[PDB]
Write a protein that binds this DNA or RNA. Structure first.
Lengths: 75, 94, 136, 58, 116
RNA sequence: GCCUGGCGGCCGUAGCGCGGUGGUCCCACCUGACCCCAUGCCGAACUCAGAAGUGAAACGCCGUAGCGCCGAUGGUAGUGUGGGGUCUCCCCAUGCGAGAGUAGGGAACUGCCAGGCA
RNA sequence: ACUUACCAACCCGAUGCAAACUGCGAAUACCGGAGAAUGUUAUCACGGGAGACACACGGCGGGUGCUAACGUCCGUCGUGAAGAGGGAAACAACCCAGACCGCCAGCUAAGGUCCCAAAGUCAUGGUUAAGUGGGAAACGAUGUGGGAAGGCCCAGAC
RNA sequence: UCCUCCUAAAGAGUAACGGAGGAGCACGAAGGUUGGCUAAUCCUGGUCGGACAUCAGGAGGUUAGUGCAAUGGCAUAAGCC
RNA sequence: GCUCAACGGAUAAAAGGUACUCCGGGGAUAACAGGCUGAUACCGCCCAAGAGUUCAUAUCGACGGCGGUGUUUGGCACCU
C-alpha cells in the first residue's frame, strides 16, 4: 500500500553569507518565502531568490514579523 | 539554625562537578541581593541528613564560607533522579 | 488495559530509550513507586500492577497511574518471512527511563504503601524503588 | 620565536582523515619523529587536534 | 480603525518605492489641512515640506482643506523642490484615493515642474 | 524646553489589561451633500463643501507589573575527539554547552521635518 | 415544572508522550573569506589505457526484525578485500602496527612477567574464599569489608 | 512514471516488498493590472426559522481561505470583491 | 498523431505445457542435513489474587514477571 516518494528537489541555500555573487546567481532555491527578498535580490516565480546585482550575500532579520531578508551589498 | 560549612569552587563545568560528586560533595550557588553570585561546594552527607528535616526549606540557613557567614535560604534543589542524593542547591540570600 | 483512544498514525518507529526521566517528583499523591531500571512497560503490566495495588490497600486510598502507554509495538506472525511490510500492532508500551514515578498513592499509611508497592513492583519488568513526597 | 618541538607517539593507521591531514600539517611522518615548529595558536590548534598521538615539549 | 486601514492601504506602494529607491512625495490629507513632504530614498530624512499649517500658505487661502488649498500646497512643494535641485520624484498618495484634493495637489505639482 | 502631526530606524525590556488626563493650535469625532466622486441597498465607507459642538469614542500622554516579553550565575541534558565498562545503555579525560527554571529586569529608546505654546 | 450515588464539553491549575508536533535549540558537519606553518601539486582541466558496478565485518546514527541472527537495508568512519608482523589459546574483518634487502645489535606499542613460554613467584595498602576469578537474570539470604545517621541503654537496655 | 511528508544522522543527497498520502488535470477567467476589503467559530437580540440558511451587535484572532494531496508559504496578502 | 503506464519507450504486430525433456551455469539461490538466532516450543523459577470446610504456598495456582535448553514450528541464507 506504500512504497512511493518523489524525487528530491535540491532546495536550500546555494550561496551563504558573505559569499560573493554575480548578478543572476540563485541564492536560495526554496518553497514558500521562508527567506524574503531584500535589497538587490529578486524573487522568482517559484520563490527562488536570485542576485539582481553583484556583491556579497547578506542574511538579515527585519521588520515587525521578524522575517529573514536577504540583501546584497554592492561589492 | 543550620550552619553549613562550605568552600569556594575554583573549578566549574560538568567535568569538575561530576569529579566533585564522586568525592562525596556537591556544588551549590549563593545568588540574590546585589552581590555577585558565589559558587560554593558543600559536603554531601551533612546537607542530606540536614534536609531530611522540613525546617531546611523554610528557616533561614547560615553558610560559613572562608570564615564568613551568609544568611541564605534554600531556593531550589536539583536532586539525583533515582538515588537519594543531591545534585545542586540554589541558595537565595536573606 | 490502557491505550490511546485515537491515534494519528498506527505504526511508530522503534527509536531508542536514552537519558533520564521527566516525571521525577511525587506530584499528585504522597507516596510513589519510582523506576530505577530502564525498560519499557506494556499495558498489561500496568494493569496487573494496578490491580495488585488496588487489592492491596483496599478500596480506600487514591492511586495515580503517572505513565501511559501510547506507543504501538508491532509483531510479525509465526512462519512469515522477513520483509513484505511492517508487522501488526499487537500491544502498547510506555517507554520508561530511570527516574519515572510510575505510580502514586495517597490516603494510606506509609506501611501499606510499602506493602502495595512491593506487591505491585513484582508484576513489572524494571527495578523499582519507593519514594515519598519531598517538599522542594 | 619560541619553536615548540613536537613528536609523534602513536601510529596513524586507523585514524580519521582529518587527523592524518593534521599530522601532515605538522609534518610528522612516522612514530618518534621529532619536528620543531613555531609556537603560534594555529600550530597549537593542530597539536590540540591530535593531542592523543603527539607528545609536545617546550 | 480608519487610520490603520489607511496605513495598510499605503503599505504596498510605500515598500515598493523603498524597494526601487526613489525620492517620494508623501501627501497627507486631513479634514482641514493637506500636508506634503519630499522624502529622501533612505526614507528617514525629509528634504522639502509644505502644508496648509504654514502661515506663508495659509494666509493667502480662504479655507485650508479644500482643492484650492491643496493646489497651493502642490505649487509650493514643486517650487521649493526645484529650488533644492530635486527634479524627479515618485508620488506616494499614502493610502488616499488619487481623486480629490490629492489629485489637485499632484496636478499642481506637475504643472509647476516636478517630474512624475 | 513642553505638546501635536507626518515619514523612518527598531521589532514585545517596545504588546496587552486596569486607572487618570488633553484640546489655543494639531488630531479625531463632527456639520451638510445639489455639485467632483461613491454605495452589488445606504454620503456607513469613499469623496466634496465646511466649523457650529464635544473630547464621549478614537488617538496621544502620564501612572499602575495582573499577564505577555527579556533574562543571568550555577547545575543538568546533549555532543566533537581519545579511552573504558557490567556495553539495546553508560562512564572517564578533554573541547563546546543548551532548553526549561531561578534571582532579577521590565510598562521602551531614537532620527529628520513641520506647526502650536513658553 | 420537581429530584438525582452517573458521565462530561469549554476554561483554569498541576503531570507525562510524539518519525510524519515546535512559541526553543546545541555539538558536529557544510559553504564562503583572511592568515601562518607543513605537504614530492597533494588541486583543477584536457587527452591515452583501464578495471569495477556480488562486497564483508567492526564503532557511531538509524529503518526493518523480537533493540533476534555471522539477519537485512541505509548514512559515516576504520579494517579486510588488496596488508604481512605482535597480541586476543587457535580466530579475514577486533587491539597494536603498516614488511625494499641484510645483521646470533638496541628501545618500545598492544599485551604481558610462577612453569609450559621471553620477562616481577616485585614493593606498599586493601578486598574475596566462592577456585569467585575462569558463563547466565528476576528474586532470596544474620556471608563479609567500608560510610553516614537513628531508637533504646549501667534511674540497668537486647 | 510523476508530486508531498517522515526515515534522512540541523547544507545537498541517501536504501528496503519501510511508514503515510496524492497526480495522469482544471481555468479565457480561477490569467494581467488597477482600486478596495478581511476570516473560522462562539455568545446575545431578532417574523416564519429549526442545532445550523438571512439581519444586527459583541467576543475572537486567521483555529479561516488558498480549483484538487501534503509540506513550505501568504495580511504589503499568495485569501475575498 | 502513443495508459509506447513494464512510463530512457526491444517489434507496426505475440499466450501456454513439459514427470518425455535437454544444455550452460549457481551453493550468487530453494528443498534435506549442519551453522547463527530463540519469536515460538519445552523445562525451571519470582509475586501471590484465589480454590483447597478453616488455611495462599499438602496439591493447584489467575493477572503479571525472570531465565534455561537447543528437543518443535520458524527466521536468516554462512557450508555443500
Amino acid at each position: 500500500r506504500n512504497g512511493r516518494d518523489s524525487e528530491a528537489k535540491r532546495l536550500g541555500v546555494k550561496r551563504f553569507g558573505g559569499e560573493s555573487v554575480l548578478a543572476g546567481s540563485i541564492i536560495v532555491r526554496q518553497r514558500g518565502t521562508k527567506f524574503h527578498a531584500g535589497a538587490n535580490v529578486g524573487c522568482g516565480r517559484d520563490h527562488t531568490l536570485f542576485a539582481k546585482a553583484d556583491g556579497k550575500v547578506k542574511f538579515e532579520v527585519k521588520g515587525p514579523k521578524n522575517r529573514k531578508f536577504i540583501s546584497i551589498e554592492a561589492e | 539554625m543550620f550552619t553549613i560549612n562550605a568552600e569556594v569552587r575554583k573549578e566549574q563545568g560538568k567535568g569538575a562537578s561530576r569529579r566533585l560528586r564522586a568525592a562525596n560533595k556537591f556544588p551549590a550557588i549563593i545568588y540574590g541581593g546585589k552581590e555577585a553570585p558565589l559558587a560554593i561546594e558543600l559536603d554531601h552527607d551533612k546537607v542530606m541528613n540536614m534536609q531530611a528535616k522540613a525546617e531546611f526549606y523554610s528557616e533561614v540557613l547560615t553558610i560559613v564560607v572562608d570564615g564568613k557567614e551568609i544568611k541564605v535560604k534554600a531556593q531550589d534543589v536539583q536532586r539525583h533522579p533515582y538515588k537519594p542524593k543531591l545534585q545542586h542547591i540554589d541558595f537565595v540570600r536573606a | 488495559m490502557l491505550q490511546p483512544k485515537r491515534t494519528k498514525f498506527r505504526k511508530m518507529h522503534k527509536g531508542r530509550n536514552r537519558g533520564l526521566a521527566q516525571g521525577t517528583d511525587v506530584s499528585f499523591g504522597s507516596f510513589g513507586l519510582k523506576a530505577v531500571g530502564r525498560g519499557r512497560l506494556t499495558a498489561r503490566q500496568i494493569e496487573a500492577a494496578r490491580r495488585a495495588m488496588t487489592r492491596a490497600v483496599k478500596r480506600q486510598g487514591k492511586i495515580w497511574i503517572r505513565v501511559f502507554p501510547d506507543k504501538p509495538i508491532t509483531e510479525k506472525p509465526l512462519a512469515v518471512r522477513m520483509g513484505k511490510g511492517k508487522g501488526n500492532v499487537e500491544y502498547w508500551v510506555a517507554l520508561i527511563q530511570p527516574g519515572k514515578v510510575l505510580y502514586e498513592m495517597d490516603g494510606v499509611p506509609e506501611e501499606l504503601a510499602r506493602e502495595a508497592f512491593k506487591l505491585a513492583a513484582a508484576k513489572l519488568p524494571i527495578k523499582t524503588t519507593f519514594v515519598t513526597k519531598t517538599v522542594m | 620565536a619560541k619553536t615548540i618541538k613536537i613528536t609523534q607517539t602513536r601510529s596513524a593507521i586507523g585514524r580519521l582523515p582529518k587527523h592524518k591531514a593534521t599530522l601532515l600539517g605538522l609534518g610528522l611522518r612516522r612514530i618518534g619523529h621529532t619536528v620543531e615548529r613555531e609556537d603560534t595558536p594555529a600550530i597549537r590548534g593542530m597539536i590540540n587536534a591530535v593531542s592523543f598521538m603527539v607528545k609536545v615539549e617546550e | 480603525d480608519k487610520k490603520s486601514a489607511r496605513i495598510r492601504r499605503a503599505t504596498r506602494a510605500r515598500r515598493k518605492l523603498q524597494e526601487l529607491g526613489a525620492t517620494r512625495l508623501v501627501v497627507h490629507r486631513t479634514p482641514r489641512h493637506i500636508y506634503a513632504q519630499v522624502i529622501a530614498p533612505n526614507g528617514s530624512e525629509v528634504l522639502v515640506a509644505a502644508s496648509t499649517v504654514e502661515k506663508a500658505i495659509a494666509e493667502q487661502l480662504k479655507y485650508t482643506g479644500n482643492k484650492d488649498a491643496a493646489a497651493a500646497v502642490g505649487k509650493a512643494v514643486a517650487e521649493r523642490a526645484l529650488e533644492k535641485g530635486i527634479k524627479d520624484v515618485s508620488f506616494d498618495r499614502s493610502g488616499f484615493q488619487y481623486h480629490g484634493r490629492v489629485q489637485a495637489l499632484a496636478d499642481a505639482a506637475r504643472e509647476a515642474g516636478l517630474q512624475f
